Symmetry: C5
Subunit: 90 residues, 5 copies
Amino acid sequence: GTHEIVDRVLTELLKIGDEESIKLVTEALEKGEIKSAKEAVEVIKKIAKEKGLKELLQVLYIVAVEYAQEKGDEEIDKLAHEALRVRQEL
Amino acid sequence: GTHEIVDRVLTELLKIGDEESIKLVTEALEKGEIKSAKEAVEVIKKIAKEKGLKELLQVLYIVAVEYAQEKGDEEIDKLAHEALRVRQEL
Amino acid sequence: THEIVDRVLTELLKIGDEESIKLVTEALEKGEIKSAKEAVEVIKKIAKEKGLKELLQVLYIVAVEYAQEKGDEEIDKLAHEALRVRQEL
Amino acid sequence: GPGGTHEIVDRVLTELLKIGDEESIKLVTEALEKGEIKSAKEAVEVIKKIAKEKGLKELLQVLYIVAVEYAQEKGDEEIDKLAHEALRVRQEL
Amino acid sequence: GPGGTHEIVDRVLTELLKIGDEESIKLVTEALEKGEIKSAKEAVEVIKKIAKEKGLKELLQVLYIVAVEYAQEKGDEEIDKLAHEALRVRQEL
Ligand SMILES: [Zn+2]
Ligand SMILES: [Zn+2]
Ligand SMILES: [Zn+2]
Ligand SMILES: [Zn+2]
Ligand SMILES: [Zn+2]
């Protein structure tokens, strides 16, 4: 759950070589800050808004919206769209 | 249903950085208008024909034929081919 | 029923082959393609006459993956003919 | 049998088209039409030797990828061995 | 056994071909051929170690992706933990 969102975000960040978001996301994971898939999205969303990381929010939208689709989870879908909104409003 | 079409369109728009189409599509989604995948294709195709958005229609054709293929939806398949006809007539 | 032509147009789009999209969509409009086999035959014939190597490339890939998916030996045979027609242009 | 034959050969041909390698395409399609390839294992073996003879590191790369993924799919340990062989041939060129 | 070893090693090689990392391909094939690997988990540890000692950032990126997806497939928390270690080792290189 936690790792399912986080690990995929990490993988997608490596593909675009966003090394700073990789560092920040992994820290949040290791700080014990993530206990659910839902928690992963809000934490990663918050981090990206604070540091102005448009590509992190793009990755986050894609990963969460597919996780929500795959699991039938309406809450994750909401956070994914809200991530893009943060991305727009940067 | 609705989000099945819209969310993949947004994901594909993100992959090519079509920031203009992303604005319009999430705007259409947020406006509570779209109640079905068929309405999703209709609204996006009409947006993109009005604005002359070749890349949106291409993404629309692909997302909608593959959705119509998966679920057996003759109406959506028709709408995808109409998306493509408008694009070629741009 | 026309699974093959849909996958062909998606691939033609990526390479921006608007002429093949046109000619392929025309064949679809007229009711010509009602099965996988007729999909490959009609598209291969159209690519042979109009001299479209890129269409035959796309058709081979699409047809051969379709054949593998469904275990359809006649489509496989058709896919390789389209490749041969390409190699002789 | 031809089931495994075309799974190897057709995916190799698909990948060669993607990189535009007409030289390999002609070499593989002619070996297939000449009856040189009657099983998955022979496909790998024939394409591997063709590529070694002509120094086609790009064809061995495709062959390795297609063969090891087929070997994992079918649990075929002989395809897997040939696949690693293809990679070694590529590496020694 | 050899199944899990090759599921890890073979995909790493596949991904290394895609980025053209011939230095890593050689070091990985060398470790495979030397019977130094009995399981998927050992494959990850040995590849992670080589990549640390030779400073191979790209091998570690490939290793994380291969190992973390294998771990998800197999419900294998030990291999997941290795995958994140591989990313940390890359961060310090
Ligand atoms: Zn993990
Ligand atoms: Zn959604
Ligand atoms: Zn259609
Ligand atoms: Zn074939
Ligand atoms: Zn192997």
